């Protein structure tokens, strides 16, 4: 009384690595990391005339 | 296949994270450069990740807005250990202003931090939970802790998060504004942390003075003690034991109601090498020293209230029969009493890996040790004194403008004090008998 | 033929099986690689009871190891005789239940039981003529106490006529390790009483007491407790595998031990037990075997049998002995303690003899006693349960995934009703 | 009949023994490949600085 | 930098203790036993 | 039997062609002189009969400087000397000059050279065209060449790698005009177009490669790497091959929609490269994460239509499929309702090569991604707004009018852009 | 004798043949140079079924390889056993189809197929007495999915009485590699159902659960896939090539499997499959083998066979066995699982026995099952195809060279009618 899906749950050995590090993927690409180099380097000057 | 992610925010958090990461590399035999020396597996997978060939990467993140400590870490002896860009630094510190760390500048660092959290969490499959380290008496620490807890609670959901917070001592203090952000932070974390532990400094000072015979302690010794407590707690995950205990097996045993999740710990034995070998250090003696109120890691007197629960982790070569016999004597003793609806209140864990020593440290080789975490009604006194100090300050509205001018609205203190009162009433109504 | 299949879940049951299989393998002369090296021909005719033959001339135990945390059986594989176990029979999850009966019975267990039910159907269905099933589990833990009884019920609907035996470790308040034991123990026994044909209760407190007083050894261990329970288990089914003066199998035991269908909670004992310092002074005789049988301290349950009256008794003897002093000493013991035997069931002791003893002991005894003394365990666990429940302590964990307090109330009511019905017969007179 | 039955044992044992070495050698060679590859970035570091 | 240095520090004990925990520690009686059927000794070939 | 012809126009096109040709020759082992010290170069070169090899490329420009530096560079002996068309007068960012006055005298010679190249060719799969769009010469000559090739050859495939002006970074002040004009020209004439604005590449090289001071050379190196990863499958054996014809059957739901944006992974310096495993899951997650997009666009504001990914190295198909399942499980990335699966995957065995003195480190596993998503409308919208701002007062228009093209042509370009925006909006809604 | 010619097209089919020929050469003991080096005399008695004889004592396969891009042919020629193939039989185009069904069926196929038809006609007339044709191809690719079907129609129009067999690979939604799969899949099935005598569906994802679960190997590959599929296809016709207790050929299977002319779509399975690490624990017996091929896991298709009912089943055994326990297990399993077996066609299992096992194995079985579960693939394909077609996406490519949406509508309607007519018998009652 077993189907193809829901059967891969059973753990066997360390080959679950290829199939389950993204179980609870902690969302993804929802965060903005554009132009965040502002902290690593030093910012260029910005002066009034 | 079991992993857990560690977060360090604030100067105290950084200085305790580096301390615990020395001990953990020391225990796993990994050299400071991270390379495996010389030439039993998967004992480092709990806190490390393999690069495919050679060294290991710790599963930790370091956050700070004032980059002096981070620069020191990046120029220190562990330069090759940490990922070069997970030691995230800002440009201006919060300067002990909770509004600054929660509304002004932390919003621009939190996104990158959460991106890093994603890049670490995607590499784990059996994520047991999160550990967070932060001092409560610091503006950036409290603010970033609150923001991270809020974001992670909605982004992840049901995962366990454990807070090793350092409350200010009742009369010994470093700053003058810390009660404000302490109350605000505890308000923030009450509905967001599954477990929080007390780590005020004065109790550790007293322990060091009494047993370690150090008349002049510093932050290094306190950090080493906290690191040893962490190692004792987490040894069960990465070492086989007769009665293993997982992180998920805490909120089912130690927190009788959702609102009550603040606990206080102790460690034993605490002793120096020049006197450690002088005594047998039996299991009964160490377990009595554990319940010795003066050995509380938080300066809160258990004799002033009832106990709800106690979870004790033994490491070494203790025997379950001996642990049970000692628990029987503890039950027999009359100076310690439990709440009526809790006849049995002990959770026990055992592990074989003896505690490791840090050379040049203060501890010695002891073949037995025990760390206890207790939930008892006595913890309400620190909340009471903190509320009184906050009321004294808010009577004249002192220092309020420094928070008002940062965009944090005036009425915010009101519901914080109300929630503190509600928690105190909750403890009072729990502590009564039926 | 008339063989039985072994199934265990939880780390406690896994540890129990790890020693039961080693002791049975030592009894049958099987090396850790599974190749026969016995000396007598008597060691092979009835090997079909617990083993299956495989290519390469080796034997595989018919055991199903099922759980939700991989570490425990990943460890048992590294132990001695860990290579006998077939890899495909290991079934386990990745999350675990964290000592939560509701989690182990509703959320993860309901999904996971599919594969373990399939493999149990495999092994029970491959057997020529099935005799029954036996399970070993502890009732202090959420996952074991929940998923074990769920699978118990599920097997019960599909095989109503087969015999079912359960080896249940119940929490004793004197030596307790967890604060949520009463809840899961009550919730589990609620279904267990409705389904299990036989349930033998085992008590860690009583095993510790036995090791302290009888063996007089300084430091008892989990290995010691496992060995005691293993010898006790072996003594029950020894006569099924070896010839004897009077063959007596599980069905005969069930017929002769249970007066009423809801009275199937027994206590078992083993003999002889002595300090190996005192081995030379021992005189292995049937009267000594019986006096160590009926000793209160020999029992592995904390319930004092002299606090109640025996309903039925059953004795299984191993070794070459004559029925004369067997029946004579049994009758003498029955007459000498008449007040402790309820009167309207005269001649309330079953006796069975098998001439092949266990390895090491010239003559041995397995004892099973149905008495009113077990009511005190249920009374004390119910007192703990109501002390927990009147304040709604530790409740929202169980309520957070579909179970309500109605099931708790029904479980406690059913437990109290069973206790009342059990002690009703204690004062019955004719 | 019992003779071929006893005969099959050593074929099976030698087959599984040979397969274990096949398992081990693959891991060993991939370790060496990753080692030389990582050491190649050492020359890359020297070239860059 | 004063306090925190790279130090030299350098499982068999764990394995030994683990097998000790599972060990017997009291064994059983000594073996005088030789397997023999009950109904086989009584019934024998006669001259 | 498999070969493809490359066309370079404009200074940007030439400086990208030079970069791709260093990489091509170093990958195939051909020395700068062209002499080799079985047949994989036939895609890009042709045997001379004895000894050296000649590229299958053509270079065009109207200002002699860049052609002169090429002809005095270290690659004097490689190219066919009469295939480097050099002019006399620059169009000076004026689209009209390059499309109506000086392109007419160029186009006949250029087509003659292309025909001479094609006669040697036998299994022509198609053409690649390289041209900066913010320059008059590039835009006008690209329009003319595409217009003539579309009628001369017809169904042959052409791929345009245009470098669009950044949303707010730009060099000239008249580039919106000729950019919009070129868009109108190429919309109905180019089979596939790839966006390559500079600002996103600046951000990438700043964040990942960790150089605080790159120039155009690094940008060209990255573009060359992308092209090589694109065209590896035509000249290297793989477990799953892809041809250039297998893009217009997979990436363009409708004939109007053929603009895609690219990405590459992993981009990392040698100081931290192998200090992490750089496995397939990490590289393919970095690929879909919004930062590594070669175009200054955010996919989170729109749906995805079709993603085509090419892996090279020792990648395992089971690795890539396990990544794809997790990506489809992912929530933030959402596809259009009328496409349940939209992934095309290709695999090649030959790992990427490294140019000596470069910035990138060598790794076994690399991935190059071409994505068609509904979010591309924002760059068109902002360019349209910039165009309307300056056309409101007829600024600079007299220069274009005085070159000979009429006044009205701006109106049709504006209407065509409006139609394109409406078409994207309509295809973006769920049924 | 009663020989069959082999023909393949497309990349997937070429890769399939590259290993099918290699494995059959191993079975018959032929070296890569085409010279016999076998040990048994039986290996050469029936070599004419697949091999033609040339001067010098060498053999050549009667295979016809067709493709639209010479890269795959050049890659397969340089591979092991790549020299067996006659250079004349290779036919390839210079442009390719580009996964466009219209391109691979209309615009260039009519021009290219004349030569391959001529060569296959020559091969057909050359052989003594033709038995039929077998084809291997994938339905996810344009050139294969179009050329194979059009060639099927042409060959059927010439040989109305010969047998037709196809190994068709279908695109499952879980492992999708090209976005235009539903279009050419539906177009191909429309034509295929009209002419093919037998079609066997193959899914990568089903193969893949098999390779991860049973073999437990870490890194699967296309070579391993081709090995499994080639063993499966060799098993069906082994009995045609070798003696046995009960001979049964393709015509036998055709008569015994399809109750109605349009229900000729099957799934196949091979046994035993075991991990090399567990090869020693498992015991090769007939009951184990029969449960093994009747497992839903080992099935080569994504469909779940317990979601429907079997029309009929057939099993081919390889190795030295008696018919007793074979037929006994067939009857036993038909009695045990009567719910999953339709009732108005009693005794719906075919058994065939061949006395020679495959090289390296003592027992082997190939199972072919006609069951109602196939409807799910066509259902999901229909949903995806209509989700594509309702918005008219990707349509102008097909429309630009003579095809119109009327044909797509007819294909969808015909396939839906096939699904409805096929599920009709699922609930039919007597
Ligand atoms: N136990 C312990 N506490 C510390 C240590 N360093 C700082 N603290 C506590 O932290 C509180 C203030 O926060 P800090 O850690 O100094 O700095 P911060 O948390 O980053 O907050 P800011 O000072 O605003 O940047 C003080 O009240 C101290 O009690 C330490 O090394 N050990
Ligand atoms: N990425 C990149 N962009 C370039 C390069 N060279 C020029 N560009 C872009 O091209 C735009 C102007 O066109 P150019 O290529 O410089 O000049 P042109 O195409 O020859 O047209 P004319 O100036 O009229 O001769 C500028 O805004 C640049 O952004 C290059 O080498 N790399
Ligand atoms: N005899 C014996 N008892 C054990 C052993 N391991 C655990 N136990 C008992 O199991 C009880 C705890 O069970 P628990 O861990 O909650 O079961 P779980 O829910 O399956 O994890 C303890 O009271 C122990 O007495 C063992 O090796 N031998
Ligand atoms: N089992 C198997 N499948 C393959 C192989 N090569 C390709 N495929 C599958 O075939 C599909 C693509 O088919 P395609 O090459 O377009 O067929 P063609 O157009 O006739 O050449 C992909 O989804 C692959 O999964 C192989 O060697 N073995
Ligand atoms: Mg600070
Ligand atoms: Mg220019």
Assigned CATH superfamily of the largest domain in chain C: Tubulin/FtsZ, GTPase domain
Radius of gyration over C-alpha positions of chain D, nearest whole angstrom: 22 Å
Shape of chain C: globular
Give the domain tally of chain C: 2
Give the oligomeric state. part of a larger assembly
- SSE series of chain C: EHEEEHEHEHEHEHHHEHEHEEHHH
Helix and strand succession of chain D? H
First CA to last CA of chain C: what distance? 43 Å
Using the CA coordinates, give the radius of gyration of chain C: 21 Å
What does the largest sheet of chain D look like? none
Number of helices of chain C: 13
Give the chain pair forming the largest contact, with residue counts: B-C, 31 and 31 residues
Per DSSP E runs of 2 or more residues, the count of β-strands of chain C stands at 12
PDB class: structural protein
Keywords: Cilia, Axoneme, Doublet Microtubule, Microtubule Inner Protein, structural protein
Entry title: 48-nm doublet microtubule from Tetrahymena thermophila strain CU428
Chain A: stpg2
Q: Could you explain how this protein is built, in words?
A:
- This is part of a larger assembly, with one copy of chain A (49 residues), two copies of chain B, two copies of chain C (430 residues), one copy of chain D (49 residues) and one copy of chain E (47 residues).
- Chain A is largely without helices or strands.
- Chain A has one helix at residues 17-20.
- Helix content of chain A is 8%, strand content 0%.
- Chain B is of the alpha/beta class and 434 residues long.
- Chain B folds into two domains: 3-262, 3-Layer(aba) Sandwich (Rossmann fold), CATH 3.40.50.1440; 263-381, 60s Ribosomal Protein L30, Chain: A, CATH 3.30.1330.
- Helix content of chain B is 40%, strand content 17%.
- Chain B has helices at 11-28, 68-75, 98-104, 107-121, 139-155, 178-190, 201-210, 219-238, 273-276, 283-291, 320-332, 380-395, 400-404, 412-431, and strands at residues 3-9, 48-50, 56-58, 60-64, 87-89, 127-135, 160-166, 195-198, 262-268, 307-316, 346-351, 368-376.
- In chain B, helix 1 crosses helix 8 (219-238), helix 3 (98-104) packs parallel to helix 5 (139-155) and helix 12 packs antiparallel against helix 14.
- The termini of chain B are far apart.
- Chain D has 49 residues and is mostly helical.
- Chain D is built from one helix and no strands.
- With 47 residues, chain E is mainly alpha-helical.
- In chain E, 34% of the residues lie in helices and 0% in strands.
- Chain E has helices at residues 12-22, 38-42.
- Chains in contact: A-B, A-C, A-F, A-G, B-C, B-D, B-E, B-F, C-D, C-E, C-G, D-F, D-G, F-G.
- The B-C interface holds B 1, 126, 240, 242-244, 246, 248-249, 251-253, 256-258, 309, 319-321, 324, 328, 340-348, 434 and C 70-71, 75, 94, 96, 98-100, 173-181, 208, 219-222, 384, 387-388, 390-391, 393-394, 396-397.
- One magnesium ion (MG) binds next to helix 1 of chain F.
- Chain D: Belongs to the CFAP53 family.
- Chain D: This is Cilia- and flagella-associated protein 53.
- Chain D: Residues 37-49 are annotated as: Disordered.
- Chain D: It is found in: Cell projection, Cilium.
